[PDB]
């Protein structure tokens, strides 16, 4: 459905955050806020990701 690609690595300081690496393709699951979305990675893990760190796929 909706995929984004990581532009930068991200680890996050909150436990709800989904860490990722530049180049990863993530699927967007929910947009509870304008700049922080819930996404799923290629291993099926879920978490919050910062919109500025990704681009549309």
């Amino acid at each position: 459905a909706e995929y984004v690609r990581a532009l930068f690595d991200f680890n996050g300081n909150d436990e709800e955050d989904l860490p990722f690496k530049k180049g990863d393709i993530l699927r967007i699951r929910d947009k509870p806020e304008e700049q922080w979305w819930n996404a799923e990675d290629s291993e099926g893990k879920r978490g919050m990701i910062p919109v500025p760190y990704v681009e549309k796929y």
């Binding site: 532009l7 806020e33 700049q35 922080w36 760190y53």
Partner: peptide, 9 residues
């Protein structure tokens, strides 16, 4: 380095 991390609401 990455862009600014947006604040969480």
């Amino acid at each position: 380095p990455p862009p600014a991390l947006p604040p969480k609401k």
